[PDB]
Amino acid sequence: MINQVYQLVAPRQFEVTYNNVDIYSDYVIVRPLYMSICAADQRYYTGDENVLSQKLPMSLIHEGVGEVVFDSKGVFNKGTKVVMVPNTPDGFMQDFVLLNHDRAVPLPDDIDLSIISYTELVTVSLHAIRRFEKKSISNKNTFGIWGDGNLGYITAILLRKLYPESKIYVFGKTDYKLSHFSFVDDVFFINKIPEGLTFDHAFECVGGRGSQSAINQMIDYISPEGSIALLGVSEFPVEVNTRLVLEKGLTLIGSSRSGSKDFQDVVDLYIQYPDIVDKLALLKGQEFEIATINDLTEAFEADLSTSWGKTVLKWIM
Numbered sequence: 001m002i003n004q005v006y007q008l009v010a011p012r013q014f015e016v017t018y019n020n021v022d023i024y025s026d027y028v029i030v031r032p033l034y035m036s037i038c039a040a041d042q043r044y045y046t047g048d049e050n051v052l053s054q055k056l057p058m059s060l061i062h063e064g065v066g067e068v069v070f071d072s073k074g075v076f077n078k079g080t081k082v083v084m085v086p087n088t089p090d091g092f093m094q095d096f097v098l099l100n101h102d103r104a105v106p107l108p109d110d111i112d113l114s115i116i117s118y119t120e121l122v123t124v125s126l127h128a129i130r131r132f133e134k135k136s137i138s139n140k141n142t143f144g145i146w147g148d149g150n151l152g153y154i155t156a157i158l159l160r161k162l163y164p165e166s167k168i169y170v171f172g173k174t175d176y177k178l179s180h181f182s183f184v185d186d187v188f189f190i191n192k193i194p195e196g197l198t199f200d201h202a203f204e205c206v207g208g209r210g211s212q213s214a215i216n217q218m219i220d221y222i223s224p225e226g227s228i229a230l231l232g233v234s235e236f237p238v239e240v241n242t243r244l245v246l247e248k249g250l251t252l253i254g255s256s257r258s259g260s261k262d263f264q265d266v267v268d269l270y271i272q273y274p275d276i277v278d279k280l281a282l283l284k285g286q287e288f289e290i291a292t293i294n295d296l297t298e299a300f301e302a303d304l305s306t307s308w309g310k311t312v313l314k315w316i317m
């Protein structure tokens with residue numbers, strides 16, 4: 001069998017190569033259905049230049065869901081709709097994706113797949129939350145979340161669904177984005193934080209040069225002996241006020257890529273509280289049906305220009 005892979009051969013420029021696919025291997029052959037563009041995929045799509053020319057031809061997307069078209073080992077029946085887990089250290093823009101049986105998680109019968117496409121973000125978030133030893137955290141704690149974007153929103157959702165009596169505060173920059181947080185107890189601008197505000201556990205869901213600012217602020221405002229979960233990637237160093245981490249006894253925990261246990265947990269949560277899938281739906285930005293190469297460039301440019309939400313891709317190549 002012949003697989004068409006849609007690789008990036010130069011920024012803002014896609015081209016198609018071929019490779020063979022063995023129907024009868026210990027993999028499960030999956031056709032992607034919906035898939036979402038990651039910040040990480042946009043770094044490559046636009047632009048070190050020696051690290052760029054390193055993996056220079058490669059497939060991009062890594063957040064997606066699909067149907068089982070073959071399973072030679074007989075585990076998943078044909079057509080089973082499944083969420084696709086990538087490798088923790090090739091991509092999904094191809095006609096078929098081969099997965100280990102533990103790298104493919106089955107979905108319920110009826111479920112909006114266009115919004116299940118960005119389940120990797122939900123796993124990243126749940127992974128971070130679970131880094132706080134659940135025995136230490138009741139629905140009597142009080143959480144803070146920096147960043148009014150996709151990770152911010154998912155984390156707010158998760159804390160509210162599973163720590164239901166707890167308090168949640170969200171800190172951001174724009175009225176547009178902060179209005180989406182309604183199930184939160186209160187919402188603040190980083191510009192307009194009242195003296196006297198307090199919380200014991202916090203989540204940094206800001207990246208880039210903004211992570212530095214977010215971190216110093218939560219260090220300053222957090223109750224002493226509080227813990228902080230680091231989620232944002234900085235791809236650079238950032239100045240930290242360590243004096244205060246000492247004086248206050250703060251614990252800072254880094255959380256990154258997730259494992260297939262988090263994908264199974266996130267699915268089992270979709271089963272449990274479908275409120276999540278409905279709240280997650282507010283993140284679905286624009287959807288694109290991808291039938292030619294052009295239909296990709298348009299989608300990537302549009303995800304560049306996008307204010308709020310994730311850009312979904314309906315795969316019909």
Ligand SMILES: NC(=O)C1=CN([C@@H]2O[C@H](COP(=O)(O)OP(=O)(O)OC[C@H]3O[C@@H](n4cnc5c(N)ncnc54)[C@H](OP(=O)(O)O)[C@@H]3O)[C@@H](O)[C@H]2O)C=CC1
Nearest residue numbers: 147148149150151172173207210213214232233255256257
């Ligand atoms: N740990 C992991 O495995 C993964 C980590 N990530 C990372 O998480 C980071 C961001 O995630 P995401 O929400 O999706 O990206 P977003 O583009 O949605 O940015 C999040 C929000 O934070 C805002 N912001 C900017 N500065 C600050 C500040 N100083 N304090 C509070 N909020 C600020 C931004 O508003 P504005 O635009 O106005 O600046 C933005 O609205 C990235 O670095 C990304 O790479 C994503 C995938 C998985």
